[PDB]
C-alpha cells in the first residue's frame, strides 16, 4: 500500500472513502511531477486580462495598461531610480514606487521604450499563438490588440483573455525582436500564404469604395491625378462611384532592378484613383481597377510581398487597414428588415411541389408503388423545389434597375447591404442568405434520416412551433459534436508531436 496503493487488490481509503495517494501517485499521472511541474510550470513576470481592439495601433505595437506594467517591470524601475540619484537605497525606491509618485511614471515610460513583451492566447495550437509586441502604455484595465493579428490568435472581442510575459536577458529580448516579432511572422508556416490579411469591416470598406454606378454625380470628367479626385470627393462635387478618366503614372521594375515610369490616361472611378495613393511604387495599376473583395486584397498583398519585400508589405497592410476602416465608416452601411427581399414566386413553387406530393401520395394509395420509392420521390420533389426557390431569390437579389444618362433603363449590380456583405466576402455566404430569405429546407432526425416535409419558412417571416422543434435536433447535435471533437483533436496533435519531437535540420 505504501509503494503503490490500489494496484494489488483493495485500496486503503481515508475517512471520506478516498484512496490514499502513494509514491507512485506522486510520480505518475496527469497530476504527477512530469506533467505538472517539469514539462510545464507557473512563472514570474506574467499577467493576464481581457482584450479589446485598438484600430490606431501599428502592426508591431500593443496596448498595455500602465497599472499592469508598473507591477511587471518593478526591478527595472528600482534600478533606474537608483541610477539617477532619486533613491539612495533600495528601500527608498521601494517606498517611492509604493506611493506612486509622478516621477516613477516617467521612469516607467523610459524603461519600456524598446522592450518587447510576449502575448499568448490559449489554447496554443501552432506557434503563432505566442507573439511579441512593443508596449504602449494606456489608461484602463484591458489589453488592446491589433485587428490584423486576431486571425492568427483565433481571437474575438467578446470576453477572451490573454497572458503577457516579459523577457529578461539580452538574448531573450533579441530573440523576441528577431524571431517572434509580429512584423516577421507575416507568412503562414503551414502553407506560405499571408496570414495578416484584412477581413470584415476593412474588406467591406475597400469593396464599397471601388465599385461603380451607372449615373453618378460628376460622371465623365477628366482629372489630372488622384489628388484632384480626392479634392472633388471631399468637396461634394463628385461621387465615389463616378466613372471618369484619370492620368496615372505607374512604375515597373527593370531587368537590372531599376524602376521605369510610364504615364497614361485610364478609365476608372474616383474611389479607385483615391485608393491608388497608398500603393507602393513597383505595382501595376490593374491591381486596383476593379471591385476588391477578400481574394483580391489577399492577392494584392501577396504580389506586394513577392515583388518588393517585407517592410513595404507591412506599411501597405497598415495603410489598407486605415483606409478600409475610414471608408466603411463613411459609407453608412446598415442592416434592415427590408433588405431580406423575398421572391414573389415562392408560393407558386411551394404550391406546385405540394400538388406533386399529393398526386404521388394518391398514386401510392392506389397501390401502384411501394413505400421507399414514394419516400425517395417526395425527397427529390422537395429538393428540386428548394433549388428553384433558391435560384429565384438569388436572381431577384443580385440586380437592380437604374436610370441611364440619356434617360434609359439599365440593369446593374445591386447595392443591397446583405448582397454587398456576401459578395465582397466580408461576412456570410449563400446558404445563410437562403435561410434568411428563401427557405430553411429539409431537416434530419437524430439518427440521420431525412424528414419528408421540409421547413418552407425563412427567418424573416418566422417559424412555427413544429418547425422550430424540428430544427432543435440538428442544432443540438452539431453543438454536442463540436464540444466533443476537440478532446480527440488534442490526442492527434499530442501524438504527432511525440513521434517527431527530435527531428532537426
Amino acid at each position: 500500500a505504501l509503494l503503490d496503493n490500489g494496484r494489488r487488490g483493495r485500496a486503503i481509503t481515508g475517512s471520506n472513502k478516498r484512496p490514499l495517494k502513494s509514491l507512485a501517485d506522486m510520480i505518475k499521472g496527469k497530476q504527477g511531477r512530469f506533467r505538472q511541474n517539469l514539462l510545464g510550470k507557473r512563472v514570474d513576470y506574467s499577467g493576464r486580462s481581457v482584450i479589446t481592439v485598438g484600430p490606431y495601433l501599428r502592426l508591431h505595437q500593443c496596448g498595455l495598461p500602465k497599472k499592469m506594467a508598473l507591477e511587471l517591470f518593478k526591478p527595472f524601475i528600482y534600478g533606474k531610480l537608483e541610477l539617477r540619484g532619486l533613491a539612495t537605497t533600495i528601500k527608498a525606491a521601494k517606498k517611492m514606487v509604493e506611493r506612486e509618485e509622478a516621477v516613477v511614471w516617467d521612469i516607467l515610460d523610459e524603461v519600456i521604450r524598446e522592450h518587447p513583451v510576449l502575448l499568448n492566447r490559449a489554447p496554443t495550437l501552432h506557434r503563432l499563438g505566442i507573439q511579441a509586441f512593443e508596449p504602449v502604455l494606456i489608461e484602463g484595465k484591458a489589453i488592446q490588440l491589433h485587428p490584423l493579428v486576431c486571425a492568427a490568435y483565433n481571437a474575438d472581442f467578446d470576453g477572451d483573455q490573454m497572458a503577457v510575459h516579459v523577457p529578461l536577458t539580452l538574448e531573450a529580448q533579441l530573440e523576441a525582436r528577431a524571431l517572434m516579432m509580429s512584423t516577421n511572422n507575416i507568412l503562414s508556416p503551414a502553407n506560405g500564404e499571408p496570414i495578416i490579411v484584412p477581413s470584415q469591416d476593412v474588406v467591406l470598406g475597400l469593396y464599397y469604395m471601388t465599385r461603380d454606378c451607372v449615373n453618378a454625380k460628376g460622371e465623365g470628367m477628366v482629372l489630372t491625378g488622384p489628388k484632384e479626385a480626392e479634392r472633388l470627393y471631399r468637396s461634394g462635387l463628385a461621387s465615389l462611384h463616378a466613372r471618369v478618366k484619370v492620368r496615372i503614372t505607374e512604375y515597373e521594375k527593370d531587368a537590372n532592378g531599376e524602376l521605369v515610369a510610364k504615364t497614361s490616361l485610364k478609365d476608372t472611378t474616383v474611389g479607385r484613383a483615391i485608393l491608388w495613393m497608398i500603393v507602393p511604387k513597383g505595382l501595376p495599376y490593374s491591381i486596383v481597377n476593379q471591385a476588391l473583395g477578400k481574394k483580391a486584397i489577399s492577392k494584392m498583398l501577396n504580389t506586394c510581398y513577392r515583388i518588393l519585400g517585407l517592410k513595404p508589405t507591412v506599411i501597405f497592410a497598415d495603410q489598407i487597414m486605415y483606409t478600409g476602416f475610414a471608408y466603411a465608416a463613411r459609407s453608412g452601411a446598415s442592416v434592415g428588415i427590408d433588405d431580406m427581399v423575398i421572391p414573389e414566386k415562392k408560393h407558386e413553387i411551394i404550391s406546385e411541389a405540394e400538388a406533386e406530393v399529393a398526386e404521388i401520395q394518391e398514386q401510392f394509395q392506389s397501390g401502384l408503388v411501394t413505400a421507399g420509392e414514394r419516400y425517395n420521390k417526395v425527397i427529390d420533389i422537395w429538393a428540386a423545389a428548394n433549388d428553384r426557390v433558391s435560384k429565384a431569390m438569388m436572381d431577384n437579389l443580385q440586380t437592380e434597375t437604374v436610370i441611364n444618362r440619356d434617360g434609359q433603363e439599365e440593369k446593374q449590380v445591386s447595392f443591397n447591404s446583405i448582397y454587398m456583405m456576401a459578395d465582397s466576402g466580408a461576412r456570410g455566404s449563400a446558404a445563410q442568405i437562403r435561410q434568411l430569405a428563401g427557405m430553411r429546407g429539409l431537416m434530419a432526425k437524430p439518427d440521420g434520416s431525412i424528414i419528408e416535409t421540409p421547413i418552407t419558412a425563412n427567418f424573416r417571416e418566422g417559424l412555427n412551433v413544429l418547425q422550430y422543434f424540428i430544427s432543435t435536433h440538428g442544432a443540438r447535435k452539431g453543438l454536442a459534436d463540436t464540444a466533443l471533437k476537440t478532446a480527440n483533436s488534442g490526442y492527434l496533435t499530442r501524438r504527432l508531436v511525440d513521434v517527431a519531437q527530435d527531428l532537426v535540420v
Binding site: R33, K41, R42, S49, G79, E175, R476
Partner: protein, 1340 residues
Amino acid sequence: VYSYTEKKRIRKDFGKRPQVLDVPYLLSIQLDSFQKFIEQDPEGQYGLEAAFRSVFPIQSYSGNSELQYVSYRLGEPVFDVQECQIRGVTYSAPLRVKLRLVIYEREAPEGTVKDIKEQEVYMGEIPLMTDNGTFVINGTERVIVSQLHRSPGVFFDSDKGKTHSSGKVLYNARIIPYRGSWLDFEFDPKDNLFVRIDRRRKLPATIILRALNYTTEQILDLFFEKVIFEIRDNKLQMELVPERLRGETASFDIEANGKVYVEKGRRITARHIRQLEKDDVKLIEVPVEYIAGKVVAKDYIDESTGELICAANMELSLDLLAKLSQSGHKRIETLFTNDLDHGPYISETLRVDPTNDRLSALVEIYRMMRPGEPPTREAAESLFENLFFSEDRYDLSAVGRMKFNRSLLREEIEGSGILSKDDIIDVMKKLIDIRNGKGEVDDIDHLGNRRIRSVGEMAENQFRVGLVRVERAVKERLSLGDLDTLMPQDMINAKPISAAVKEFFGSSQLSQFMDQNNPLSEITHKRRISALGPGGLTRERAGFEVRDVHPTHYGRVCPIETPEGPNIGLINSLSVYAQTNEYGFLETPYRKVTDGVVTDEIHYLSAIEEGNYVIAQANSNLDEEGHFVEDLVTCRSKGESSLFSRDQVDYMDVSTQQVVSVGASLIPFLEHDDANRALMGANMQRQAVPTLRADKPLVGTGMERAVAVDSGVTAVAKRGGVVQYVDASRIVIKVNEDEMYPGEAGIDIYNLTKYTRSNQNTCINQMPCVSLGEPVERGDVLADGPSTDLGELALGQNMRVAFMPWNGYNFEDSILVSERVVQEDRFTTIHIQELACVSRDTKLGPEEITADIPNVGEAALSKLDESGIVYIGAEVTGGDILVGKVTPKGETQLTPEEKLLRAIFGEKASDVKDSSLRVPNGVSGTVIDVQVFTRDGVEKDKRALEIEEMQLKQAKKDLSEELQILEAGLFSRIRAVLVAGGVEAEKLDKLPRDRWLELGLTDEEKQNQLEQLAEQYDELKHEFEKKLEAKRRKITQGDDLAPGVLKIVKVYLAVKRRIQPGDKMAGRHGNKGVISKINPIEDMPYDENGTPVDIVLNPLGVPSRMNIGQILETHLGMAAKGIGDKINAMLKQQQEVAKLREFIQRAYDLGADVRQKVDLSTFSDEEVMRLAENLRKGMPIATPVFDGAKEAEIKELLKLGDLPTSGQIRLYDGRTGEQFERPVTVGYMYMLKLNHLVDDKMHARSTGSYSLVTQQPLGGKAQFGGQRFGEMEVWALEAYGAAYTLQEMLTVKSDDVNGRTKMYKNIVDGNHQMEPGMPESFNVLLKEIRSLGINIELED
C-alpha cells in the same frame, strides 16, 4: 377589469390566440414534493410514515421483547427564516416519535403481554423548506436539484452488432429495483443464455432455474412443447398436426387415406397445410430415419430390465428405437422445434450447464458471489434467499412493480415488492420471444422510461438509511437482559439519523448554493433537472445519444435551454406547463376535441399515453363556437407530424409557449432567431447584474409579471386594505373588516430588506411602490425587489442604438458606448463584501478585541470606537484597521533588558502582540454593517449592546402599533357605555382617557360592564407585556460557536462599479460583446434634430448569426418610443384629458384582431392622468414567443407615431458634420450587463510567494500567483527556435532558487544576464524515485 398594480401601467399585447389555461405557479415541483415528505400520511406509502413502517417493529433474536412505532410529530422552529439568516444557523424543526417497548413472558401461548412502556423520544432536527422552495443551512439559502433517472423494472435491449465482427445482435434483459441487486439475462453468439448478478462473472441460465428447485423435465415442459409419437405396430404411425409443418420440407413420402399429399423432395406450403387441415389428416406413416435427430423430453425405463433407456433432453438413434420398441413403450415424447421460430436455446444451455441438481447450484452461486472460502449448504441457501426474496434487502417499489407488470402485459398494477419464480420465468420467456423474432426492444431515452425524483424522495431515502443503522444498534443493544428498567429513550441514540440528514442537506452533490444574480436565476435554478448525481450518469460515461432532443420532450423538457460544454444535454429545464404523475413521470395538458368541436376540458397526458392519439397544433384557426376552420389540420400522431382530417383529431395544444421554458419564453421574436443563438441568449439572460434603477423592457412577451411575482423577491399583499403607513423601510396596511378575524387588530406589517449581501456579492434592496392612503387588494405588489419595476422583471436598460461601422471600434463584436451613458449611471452596480475577525482562546490566555494597540500610531486608531471596531460609514482602503485585536506572547523571562523596556514603555507593550483585521490590499469601500457573535457566558461589549438595543426598538415599535389600536377600541367602548348613564359630555372628554377608569355609576349593569372592561384592559396590557418579554428573551440569547472560539466580528463593505472598456454586455438574442471605447458626446452620430445615439453596433454580426429578432426588436422599440414621445409632448403643453385619452385609446386599439381589449371610458380622470404619466417614456409592448407581432403591425405603429416605415433615418457625423451616404437603422434595444467585470480579471505579478515542496509560484489571483506556461507554449517556443527564452522561462522564473536571487540582483544592477542552475522539481523527482527503492543518480 385590471388590478391596481396593473392599471398603473398597461402593456399593449399583440397576441391573437385566446388563453384557456393560466400559467401555473412556477415553484410547485419543490413545494409539493416537500409537502409529501413532511405531511401526515394515514397509509405508509409516502414520507416519514413510510420510512418508519419500513423498519419497525424491531424484534430481538430471543423474541421476548420488541419496540413498536406509534406516531411522530414536528415541533415549532426556535427561530424564523430571517432570524436564522442573521444568526447563521439552520432553519429546522425537532422530531418527536412515540415508541412503545413491550416485553413477552416465556412458556405461554403466542406472546404474553408481560409489560408495556410508552415514551416520546427525540430523533433530531429536520430542515424545513421556506415559502420560496429553499433551505436555510448555516444561514445560507440552498437549492436541491431534481434528478432524472431510470425507472425501476425490467428493460430489454440489444447492442447493434458492434461488439462482434460478424454483425450479430446480442439481446439482453435487465431487472433493476428501487433498492437491491440487479439481475441480467443475456444471449451469446452461440445462442446460449447466461445470467449475471451485480455485474459479475457470467454464469449459465440453468443455474438460477436449478436454484429454484426445478427439474429438467419441468424446465423442458415450461419452455419447449411436446410431441407424442405413437407405436401402432407398423413403423411408428404418427398423429400429425399440420401447423407444425409450416416453413419446412418433407424428407419422406407423406400419405393418408391412399392420397399422397406431400411427396419426398416436395416442401410443405400453405396450400398443403390448408388441405391437410380440411381433410383432417392425422395418421401419418414415417420411416425410422425420421427420428434420427429428434430430442427426447423425459426419461423412459424398461419395465422388464428395470434400468433406464435414456435420459432427459437427449437425441435418439435407430438402436434406441429398437430398444424402446421391445420395451413396450407405445408413446415417445419429443420437443417440437424448428429453425425459424421455436429455436432451441434452453436445451443447449442445459447441456453446457455443469450442474444437474439443486444443492450444487447454490454452491456455485455462492462461489460466484463469494469466492475464496469453503462453501456451506446453509450459507448458500441463506445468501440466495436474501438476495431477491427478502423484504429487507430487495424492494421493487410501486412504480417498479407497475412498470414490471406493464412490460409483461399483466392485468394487475399492484403487487409484491420482491421477485418470484413466475416473474423470472416470464422475463426469460419474453427475452426468448424477442430472440425468436416477435416483439421489440425498449427505448431507454423515451421519457416514459425515465423518472423524476425530487427532494422529498431523497430526504426519505437518507432518513431510512440513518434509521436502519439506528435499528441495527438497537438490535445489538437489546439482546441483553435489563427489560425491567430499560426505556426507549436509553435504547436509541439520535446522532446517526441527524448526522445523515445534515450530510444530505449540506454536502450532497445535488444540494447547491442558490444562484442569486437576479430573480430569473433563482427561478431557473429551482426548476432544473439533472441526469447526474448518486444513481445517475457521469459526463465521461454518459454517451452521445442521451444528450439529444427526443420527440417525447415536446411539452415536458425545453429543447433550447441547456448548458454548452461538457454538460450539454445532461442538465435540462422544465417547460412552462409540465407536471409529474403520482409515479414521477412528466405530463402535459391538452384540450379535448369532441366531434370536431374543441372543448375547454383539460387532460394531462404522459409520454406513453400521448402517442396513442392524434394531437393538433395550437396554430389552428377556430370559429366562434369552437369549430376547425379548415378540414386538413397538421397533427402529431406517433412521433411524426402530417395532415389529418377534421374528425380524426383527439386533442389540441393549450398554448403556443407550451414547448419552451421560462427563460426561453422571455425572448421576444424568438421565432426569427436561430436555435444556437437562442440557446446562448437564454444562458446569458440569467447572469445579468441589477443596476441602481430598474427599467422595464419596453418590448416584452407578457411573462415578466409572473416571474417577478412567483420568485418571491417582491412584497405581495396578504390581505386587502388601505396603506396606513409607508416609509423607505416598512409598510403598514390597515386590513379591511370583512377579511379580518374576530378579536384582533387588523394590521399587516411588512419590513423591507435594505442593502443586503447576496451569494454572488451583489446588492439586495427593496423599495416601496405604493403611496400613503391608497387601496390595495390581496396579491398586489407593495415593494419592488432587485431587477423589478412596478411588479415586472427588469433585467437591463433601454438603449438608443444604431447599426453601422464606426472607424474600427466595433470590429469583431466590440461595442462603442457614449459618454452620456456613463454620466447617467445607467449601468452602475453595487457590490457588498464580508470580512471576519475571530478571537479564540489559547493556552497562554485569551485574545482580546481592544482599541489599545501598543504599536500603532494615533492616526491609525481614529476610525475605531471604544470597543476597537470601526465606525459605521467609514471610508476605508487597503491597509486600514477594521477590528483591533491583540494576542498574548507568552511569559518571557524577566531579563534586565526586558525590565528596562517594561519600565520605560509600559507593561501592555511587553505582554501582547498585534493580530488585528486589516483591509486587504486593493480593496476599498464604505462600512455599512457590523455584526458581533459572542459565546454564552462571555461578557458583551458596548457595540453588541448597541446592536441589541437597535433590534429591540423595532419589536417594541410593532407591538406598540398593535396595542394602540386595541386600546383605542377598548376606550371607545368605555366611552360609549359611559354615554348611556351619567354622560358628562364635555366633562368626559376634557380629561384624558385613563381618567375615565376612575369613575362610579349606579348599581345597575353599568358597574358590572365597567368592571369587565377594566379587567379586559388589564388582561390586554399583561398579554402585550408577555409578548415584549418573550421578544427580548429571544433577541438577547447567546450564540453557539465552534470550540475554542470566543468572539466573531463581521464587517460589510459596499462599493460602486461603473462601466468601462473591457466590460461585457449582451442582448436577449445571443448578441454579446465587450466595450472598446467610451466616446465623448459630440463625436457620436446624430439625426436631424440633433439627438445622438447611445450605442453603435456592427451590422456585420447579424447576417452570419441569423438572429433576426434583434432587428425587429429595434424597429418595435423605435415605434414604442415614438408613441411615448407623442404622449410626453402632449403632457408638456398642458392639454385636455379628453385628447390624451383619445390618443391613448387609438394606441391601444391598434392591431389585427388582437385578443386584448382596453376601454378607457371606465377610467376616471385621475387614473387616466396617472397612466399617461407612466407612459411618457415609451409604451410597453408584449409579443408572445410564437404569437407575436407582424411587420405590418409594426409599420402601422410606426405610422401612428409619425416615424419612417422602413425604420431607417439619416445620420450626421459628429466629428465633421457630414451626412452618412446611406440610411441607418436606429432604434431601441434592451441591453444587459453581465457578471464578467474587468476589475475581477486584471492581474499581474513580478515576484511573490512560492510552494513549499516544488518551490514554484502559486496559482490564482487570490494568491497573487503567476501564469502557467504549459507544454503547448513550450512547443511554440521550440518551433520558433528561441532557446534562451525557454531556458529563462524554465529556471530563473519558476524554481531555480539561487538563479532567481541572482537574476533579481543583476536586473537591479543593470546587467541583463542569468546564471541558470538545476530546477528544484527535478531534485524532488530524484528523491521520490529513490524512495521507491530504485537507484537513479546523476553521472559525472
